[PDB]
Design a protein around this ligand. Structure first.
Ligand SMILES: *[C@@H]1O[C@H](CO)[C@@H](O[C@@H]2O[C@H](CO)[C@@H](O[C@@H]3O[C@H](CO)[C@@H](O)[C@H](O)[C@@H]3O)[C@H](O)[C@H]2NC(C)=O)[C@H](O)[C@H]1NC(C)=O
Lengths: 112, 230
Protein backbone atom coordinates (compact mmCIF):
# COMPACT_ATOMS: atom_id res chain seq x y z
CA UNK A 1 0.00 0.00 0.00
CA UNK A 2 1.29 3.40 1.09
CA UNK A 3 5.06 3.75 0.56
CA UNK A 4 5.15 0.08 -0.41
CA UNK A 5 7.71 0.45 -3.21
CA UNK A 6 10.22 2.50 -1.19
CA UNK A 7 12.76 -0.33 -1.49
CA UNK A 8 11.88 -1.36 -5.04
CA UNK A 9 13.61 -0.01 -8.13
CA UNK A 10 12.60 3.24 -9.82
CA UNK A 11 10.85 1.29 -12.58
CA UNK A 12 8.70 -0.74 -10.20
CA UNK A 13 7.70 2.33 -8.17
CA UNK A 14 6.46 4.15 -11.30
CA UNK A 15 3.33 1.95 -11.47
CA UNK A 16 1.98 2.85 -8.00
CA UNK A 17 2.05 6.66 -8.02
CA UNK A 18 -1.67 7.00 -7.24
CA UNK A 19 -1.17 5.29 -3.86
CA UNK A 20 1.09 8.10 -2.67
CA UNK A 21 -1.03 10.68 -4.51
CA UNK A 22 -4.20 9.80 -2.58
CA UNK A 23 -2.47 9.81 0.83
CA UNK A 24 -1.68 13.54 0.70
CA UNK A 25 -5.11 15.22 1.00
CA UNK A 26 -7.24 13.21 3.45
CA UNK A 27 -5.21 10.13 4.43
CA UNK A 28 -10.54 22.63 24.25
CA UNK A 29 -9.94 25.56 21.92
CA UNK A 30 -6.16 25.17 22.28
CA UNK A 31 -6.17 21.69 20.73
CA UNK A 32 -8.88 22.66 18.24
CA UNK A 33 -6.69 25.41 16.78
CA UNK A 34 -3.67 23.10 16.52
CA UNK A 35 -5.54 20.46 14.51
CA UNK A 36 -7.05 23.04 12.14
CA UNK A 37 -3.62 24.45 11.26
CA UNK A 38 -2.40 21.00 10.20
CA UNK A 39 -5.26 20.63 7.72
CA UNK A 40 -4.73 24.15 6.39
CA UNK A 41 -1.00 23.44 5.91
CA UNK A 42 -1.71 20.17 4.08
CA UNK A 43 -4.15 21.96 1.77
CA UNK A 44 -1.58 24.70 1.11
CA UNK A 45 1.17 22.19 0.27
CA UNK A 46 -1.14 20.31 -2.09
CA UNK A 47 -2.19 23.54 -3.82
CA UNK A 48 1.41 24.70 -4.25
CA UNK A 49 2.37 21.38 -5.84
CA UNK A 50 -0.66 21.55 -8.15
CA UNK A 51 0.19 25.12 -9.17
CA UNK A 52 3.77 24.12 -9.96
CA UNK A 53 2.57 21.19 -12.08
CA UNK A 54 0.10 23.43 -13.91
CA UNK A 55 2.79 26.03 -14.61
CA UNK A 56 5.09 23.34 -16.04
CA UNK A 57 2.34 22.38 -18.51
CA UNK A 58 1.51 19.13 -16.69
CA UNK A 59 -1.94 19.90 -15.26
CA UNK A 60 -3.86 16.86 -14.04
CA UNK A 61 -1.14 14.28 -14.72
CA UNK A 62 0.96 11.81 -12.76
CA UNK A 63 3.58 11.21 -15.48
CA UNK A 64 4.39 14.06 -17.85
CA UNK A 65 6.86 14.29 -20.73
CA UNK A 66 8.59 17.59 -21.46
CA UNK A 67 10.60 19.24 -24.23
CA UNK A 68 13.65 19.90 -22.02
CA UNK A 69 16.60 17.69 -23.06
CA UNK A 70 18.57 15.95 -20.32
CA UNK A 71 22.00 17.49 -19.79
CA UNK A 72 24.70 14.85 -19.41
CA UNK A 73 26.38 16.92 -16.69
CA UNK A 74 23.42 16.31 -14.36
CA UNK A 75 24.02 12.54 -14.45
CA UNK A 76 26.01 10.20 -16.69
CA UNK A 77 24.31 6.91 -15.76
CA UNK A 78 22.49 5.16 -18.58
CA UNK A 79 18.83 4.15 -18.47
CA UNK A 80 19.62 0.51 -17.66
CA UNK A 81 21.24 1.32 -14.29
CA UNK A 82 18.76 4.08 -13.34
CA UNK A 83 15.33 2.49 -13.84
CA UNK A 84 16.48 -1.05 -12.98
CA UNK A 85 19.28 -0.72 -10.39
CA UNK A 86 18.26 2.32 -8.34
CA UNK A 87 15.58 3.62 -5.99
CA UNK A 88 14.08 7.10 -5.77
CA UNK A 89 15.67 7.76 -2.37
CA UNK A 90 19.12 7.26 -3.90
CA UNK A 91 18.25 9.25 -7.03
CA UNK A 92 17.13 12.27 -4.99
CA UNK A 93 20.37 12.28 -2.99
CA UNK A 94 22.32 12.41 -6.26
CA UNK A 95 20.27 14.99 -8.21
CA UNK A 96 19.56 17.27 -5.23
CA UNK A 97 22.23 19.69 -6.51
CA UNK A 98 20.67 20.34 -9.94
CA UNK A 99 16.97 20.46 -8.99
CA UNK A 100 16.55 24.25 -9.16
CA UNK A 101 18.25 24.52 -12.56
CA UNK A 102 15.92 21.85 -13.96
CA UNK A 103 12.86 23.56 -12.46
CA UNK A 104 13.84 26.91 -13.98
CA UNK A 105 14.48 25.28 -17.35
CA UNK A 106 11.06 23.60 -17.23
CA UNK A 107 9.33 26.89 -16.41
CA UNK A 108 11.09 28.92 -19.10
CA UNK A 109 10.63 26.15 -21.67
CA UNK A 110 6.89 25.89 -21.05
CA UNK A 111 6.40 29.66 -21.08
CA UNK A 112 8.30 29.85 -24.39
CA UNK B 1 10.53 58.55 -24.37
CA UNK B 2 12.81 55.75 -25.61
CA UNK B 3 16.31 56.46 -26.93
CA UNK B 4 19.12 54.32 -28.34
CA UNK B 5 22.82 55.25 -28.22
CA UNK B 6 25.45 53.49 -30.33
CA UNK B 7 29.24 53.46 -30.46
CA UNK B 8 31.55 55.34 -32.83
CA UNK B 9 32.86 54.62 -36.30
CA UNK B 10 34.95 51.50 -36.93
CA UNK B 11 37.72 50.69 -39.39
CA UNK B 12 38.97 47.11 -39.70
CA UNK B 13 40.87 44.74 -41.98
CA UNK B 14 39.72 41.88 -44.18
CA UNK B 15 39.15 38.66 -42.25
CA UNK B 16 38.92 40.40 -38.86
CA UNK B 17 35.91 40.85 -36.56
CA UNK B 18 33.89 43.88 -35.48
CA UNK B 19 31.72 44.47 -32.41
CA UNK B 20 29.06 47.15 -31.93
CA UNK B 21 27.02 48.11 -28.87
CA UNK B 22 23.59 49.71 -28.45
CA UNK B 23 22.30 51.08 -25.14
CA UNK B 24 18.62 51.76 -24.45
CA UNK B 25 16.97 54.34 -22.19
CA UNK B 26 13.30 54.59 -21.28
CA UNK B 27 11.91 51.02 -21.40
CA UNK B 28 12.12 47.70 -19.62
CA UNK B 29 15.00 45.90 -21.32
CA UNK B 30 13.94 42.27 -20.97
CA UNK B 31 10.55 42.55 -22.72
CA UNK B 32 11.50 44.88 -25.60
CA UNK B 33 12.50 43.54 -29.01
CA UNK B 34 15.84 44.76 -30.39
CA UNK B 35 16.97 44.46 -34.01
CA UNK B 36 20.16 45.11 -35.97
CA UNK B 37 19.93 46.41 -39.55
CA UNK B 38 22.50 47.60 -42.08
CA UNK B 39 22.54 49.87 -45.13
CA UNK B 40 25.22 49.82 -47.80
CA UNK B 41 26.28 53.13 -49.40
CA UNK B 42 23.81 53.78 -52.22
CA UNK B 43 21.73 50.63 -51.66
CA UNK B 44 18.65 49.80 -49.60
CA UNK B 45 18.16 48.46 -46.09
CA UNK B 46 19.00 44.90 -45.06
CA UNK B 47 17.47 43.47 -41.87
CA UNK B 48 20.32 41.54 -40.26
CA UNK B 49 18.80 40.16 -37.06
CA UNK B 50 16.61 40.70 -34.03
CA UNK B 51 15.37 39.13 -30.82
CA UNK B 52 13.57 39.57 -27.51
CA UNK B 53 16.12 39.25 -24.67
CA UNK B 54 13.71 37.31 -22.44
CA UNK B 55 13.23 34.49 -24.97
CA UNK B 56 16.98 34.17 -25.50
CA UNK B 57 17.00 32.67 -29.02
CA UNK B 58 17.81 35.27 -31.70
CA UNK B 59 16.75 35.10 -35.33
CA UNK B 60 19.20 35.54 -38.21
CA UNK B 61 19.14 35.86 -41.98
CA UNK B 62 20.38 32.78 -43.83
CA UNK B 63 22.92 34.88 -45.76
CA UNK B 64 24.63 35.99 -42.53
CA UNK B 65 24.21 32.64 -40.76
CA UNK B 66 27.49 31.52 -39.20
CA UNK B 67 28.99 35.03 -39.30
CA UNK B 68 26.72 37.11 -37.02
CA UNK B 69 26.17 36.96 -33.27
CA UNK B 70 23.61 39.01 -31.32
CA UNK B 71 23.83 39.10 -27.52
CA UNK B 72 22.40 41.16 -24.67
CA UNK B 73 23.48 42.44 -21.26
CA UNK B 74 20.65 43.39 -18.92
CA UNK B 75 22.99 44.67 -16.20
CA UNK B 76 24.27 47.34 -18.60
CA UNK B 77 21.08 47.19 -20.72
CA UNK B 78 23.20 46.98 -23.89
CA UNK B 79 22.79 44.78 -26.95
CA UNK B 80 25.96 43.68 -28.75
CA UNK B 81 26.42 42.65 -32.38
CA UNK B 82 29.52 40.77 -33.54
CA UNK B 83 30.32 40.30 -37.23
CA UNK B 84 33.18 38.01 -38.29
CA UNK B 85 35.03 37.35 -41.55
CA UNK B 86 34.66 40.85 -42.98
CA UNK B 87 34.70 41.16 -46.77
CA UNK B 88 35.09 44.07 -49.18
CA UNK B 89 31.32 44.67 -49.28
CA UNK B 90 30.83 44.91 -45.49
CA UNK B 91 31.50 48.67 -45.40
CA UNK B 92 28.11 50.11 -44.45
CA UNK B 93 26.07 52.00 -41.85
CA UNK B 94 24.70 49.78 -39.08
CA UNK B 95 21.51 50.74 -37.24
CA UNK B 96 20.07 49.54 -33.94
CA UNK B 97 16.27 49.57 -33.75
CA UNK B 98 13.67 48.71 -31.15
CA UNK B 99 10.05 47.64 -31.11
CA UNK B 100 7.32 46.34 -28.86
CA UNK B 101 5.79 42.87 -28.91
CA UNK B 102 3.09 40.90 -27.13
CA UNK B 103 2.14 37.26 -26.64
CA UNK B 104 -1.09 35.42 -27.44
CA UNK B 105 -0.08 32.22 -25.64
CA UNK B 106 1.59 28.97 -26.61
CA UNK B 107 4.86 30.50 -27.77
CA UNK B 108 3.25 32.98 -30.18
CA UNK B 109 4.71 36.49 -30.33
CA UNK B 110 3.32 39.40 -32.33
CA UNK B 111 5.37 42.48 -33.25
CA UNK B 112 4.70 46.00 -34.51
CA UNK B 113 7.88 46.95 -36.40
CA UNK B 114 10.79 49.20 -35.45
CA UNK B 115 9.53 52.49 -34.00
CA UNK B 116 12.83 53.63 -32.42
CA UNK B 117 16.03 53.98 -34.45
CA UNK B 118 19.61 54.76 -33.50
CA UNK B 119 21.91 57.22 -35.22
CA UNK B 120 23.93 54.47 -36.90
CA UNK B 121 27.61 53.58 -36.97
CA UNK B 122 29.86 53.52 -40.03
CA UNK B 123 32.01 50.41 -40.49
CA UNK B 124 34.73 50.35 -43.16
CA UNK B 125 37.30 47.71 -44.13
CA UNK B 126 40.17 48.53 -46.48
CA UNK B 127 43.93 48.15 -46.90
CA UNK B 128 44.52 51.86 -46.22
CA UNK B 129 45.41 53.37 -42.85
CA UNK B 130 44.10 56.31 -40.85
CA UNK B 131 44.99 59.82 -42.02
CA UNK B 132 44.42 63.13 -40.26
CA UNK B 133 42.20 65.59 -42.11
CA UNK B 134 43.56 68.75 -43.72
CA UNK B 135 41.43 71.90 -43.55
CA UNK B 136 41.70 74.86 -45.91
CA UNK B 137 39.52 77.99 -45.56
CA UNK B 138 37.66 78.99 -48.72
CA UNK B 139 37.88 82.74 -47.99
CA UNK B 140 35.22 85.02 -49.51
CA UNK B 141 36.24 87.68 -52.01
CA UNK B 142 34.72 90.02 -54.59
CA UNK B 143 34.19 87.08 -56.96
CA UNK B 144 32.01 85.32 -54.34
CA UNK B 145 29.61 88.27 -53.85
CA UNK B 146 26.37 88.45 -55.85
CA UNK B 147 23.52 90.78 -54.90
CA UNK B 148 24.89 91.56 -51.44
CA UNK B 149 25.42 87.88 -50.55
CA UNK B 150 28.95 86.48 -50.26
CA UNK B 151 29.88 82.80 -50.04
CA UNK B 152 32.62 81.35 -47.83
CA UNK B 153 33.46 77.96 -46.39
CA UNK B 154 36.01 75.28 -45.57
CA UNK B 155 37.37 72.38 -47.61
CA UNK B 156 38.58 69.08 -46.14
CA UNK B 157 41.22 67.07 -48.01
CA UNK B 158 43.51 64.09 -47.37
CA UNK B 159 41.46 62.20 -44.80
CA UNK B 160 40.45 58.56 -44.46
CA UNK B 161 38.11 56.90 -43.64
CA UNK B 162 34.60 58.37 -43.41
CA UNK B 163 33.00 60.29 -41.81
CA UNK B 164 33.92 63.89 -40.90
CA UNK B 165 31.42 66.21 -39.21
CA UNK B 166 31.44 69.91 -40.15
CA UNK B 167 29.62 72.61 -38.17
CA UNK B 168 29.49 76.41 -38.26
CA UNK B 169 29.76 78.58 -35.14
CA UNK B 170 29.24 75.48 -32.97
CA UNK B 171 25.87 74.96 -34.65
CA UNK B 172 24.72 78.57 -34.24
CA UNK B 173 24.46 79.10 -38.02
CA UNK B 174 22.53 76.51 -40.03
CA UNK B 175 20.73 78.56 -42.67
CA UNK B 176 22.44 78.66 -46.05
CA UNK B 177 24.95 75.94 -45.10
CA UNK B 178 25.60 73.37 -47.84
CA UNK B 179 27.85 70.38 -47.15
CA UNK B 180 28.58 68.59 -50.41
CA UNK B 181 29.02 64.80 -50.17
CA UNK B 182 32.56 63.45 -50.09
CA UNK B 183 34.14 62.02 -53.24
CA UNK B 184 36.93 59.53 -53.91
CA UNK B 185 40.00 60.64 -55.87
CA UNK B 186 42.65 58.60 -57.66
CA UNK B 187 44.91 58.90 -54.59
CA UNK B 188 42.53 56.71 -52.57
CA UNK B 189 41.52 59.46 -50.12
CA UNK B 190 38.35 61.52 -49.72
CA UNK B 191 37.62 65.23 -50.01
CA UNK B 192 34.70 67.60 -49.53
CA UNK B 193 33.87 71.29 -49.16
CA UNK B 194 31.22 72.82 -46.88
CA UNK B 195 30.14 76.34 -47.83
CA UNK B 196 27.73 78.98 -46.53
CA UNK B 197 26.29 82.18 -48.01
CA UNK B 198 25.98 85.19 -45.69
CA UNK B 199 25.15 88.87 -46.20
CA UNK B 200 28.19 90.85 -47.31
CA UNK B 201 27.69 93.43 -44.55
CA UNK B 202 28.36 90.75 -41.91
CA UNK B 203 31.79 89.79 -43.30
CA UNK B 204 33.53 92.56 -41.35
CA UNK B 205 31.40 92.18 -38.21
CA UNK B 206 30.57 88.46 -37.80
CA UNK B 207 33.31 85.92 -37.08
CA UNK B 208 32.90 82.62 -38.93
CA UNK B 209 34.54 79.43 -37.64
CA UNK B 210 34.18 75.96 -39.14
CA UNK B 211 34.59 73.06 -36.69
CA UNK B 212 35.54 69.71 -38.24
CA UNK B 213 35.71 66.41 -36.37
CA UNK B 214 37.29 63.17 -37.62
CA UNK B 215 36.58 60.59 -34.91
CA UNK B 216 38.62 57.63 -36.29
CA UNK B 217 41.67 59.93 -36.33
CA UNK B 218 40.40 61.69 -33.15
CA UNK B 219 41.02 65.06 -34.81
CA UNK B 220 39.16 68.29 -33.99
CA UNK B 221 40.07 71.40 -35.99
CA UNK B 222 38.48 74.85 -35.69
CA UNK B 223 39.37 77.01 -38.70
CA UNK B 224 38.48 80.70 -38.87
CA UNK B 225 37.30 82.14 -42.19
CA UNK B 226 37.91 85.80 -43.05
CA UNK B 227 37.96 87.66 -46.38
CA UNK B 228 41.35 87.41 -48.06
CA UNK B 229 43.61 90.39 -47.38
CA UNK B 230 44.25 92.54 -50.45
C1 LIG C 1 9.17 55.85 -17.38
O1 LIG C 1 10.20 55.98 -16.44
C2 LIG C 1 11.48 55.86 -17.01
C3 LIG C 1 12.48 55.70 -15.89
O2 LIG C 1 12.24 56.68 -14.92
C4 LIG C 1 11.75 57.05 -17.93
O3 LIG C 1 12.94 56.85 -18.66
C5 LIG C 1 13.73 58.06 -18.71
O4 LIG C 1 13.48 58.76 -19.90
C6 LIG C 1 14.22 59.96 -20.04
C7 LIG C 1 13.69 60.71 -21.25
O5 LIG C 1 12.32 60.97 -21.08
C8 LIG C 1 15.71 59.64 -20.12
O6 LIG C 1 16.49 60.81 -20.15
C9 LIG C 1 17.44 60.74 -21.24
O7 LIG C 1 18.63 60.10 -20.82
C10 LIG C 1 19.82 60.18 -21.61
C11 LIG C 1 20.98 60.64 -20.74
O8 LIG C 1 20.80 62.01 -20.44
C12 LIG C 1 19.67 60.95 -22.92
O9 LIG C 1 19.15 60.11 -23.94
C13 LIG C 1 18.72 62.17 -22.87
O10 LIG C 1 19.41 63.39 -22.80
C14 LIG C 1 17.73 62.17 -21.68
O11 LIG C 1 18.21 62.88 -20.57
C15 LIG C 1 16.10 58.88 -18.85
O12 LIG C 1 17.43 58.43 -18.90
C16 LIG C 1 15.21 57.66 -18.66
N1 LIG C 1 15.52 56.99 -17.43
C17 LIG C 1 16.02 55.74 -17.34
C18 LIG C 1 16.27 55.25 -15.94
O13 LIG C 1 16.25 55.04 -18.31
C19 LIG C 1 10.62 57.15 -18.96
O14 LIG C 1 10.66 58.35 -19.68
C20 LIG C 1 9.23 57.04 -18.33
N2 LIG C 1 8.24 56.92 -19.36
C21 LIG C 1 7.20 57.75 -19.53
C22 LIG C 1 6.29 57.41 -20.68
O15 LIG C 1 6.98 58.71 -18.81
Amino acid sequence: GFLGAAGSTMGAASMTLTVQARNLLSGLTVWGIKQLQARVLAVERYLRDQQLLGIWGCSGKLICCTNVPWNSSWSNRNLSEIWDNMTWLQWDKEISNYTQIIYGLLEESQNQ
Amino acid sequence: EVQLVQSGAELKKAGSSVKLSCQAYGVAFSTYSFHWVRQAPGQGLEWLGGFIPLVGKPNYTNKFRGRLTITADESARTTYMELRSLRSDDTAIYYCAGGGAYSSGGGRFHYFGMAVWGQGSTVTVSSASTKGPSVFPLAPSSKSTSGGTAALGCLVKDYFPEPVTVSWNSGALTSGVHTFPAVLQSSGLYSLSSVVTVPSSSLGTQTYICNVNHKPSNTKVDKRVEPKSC
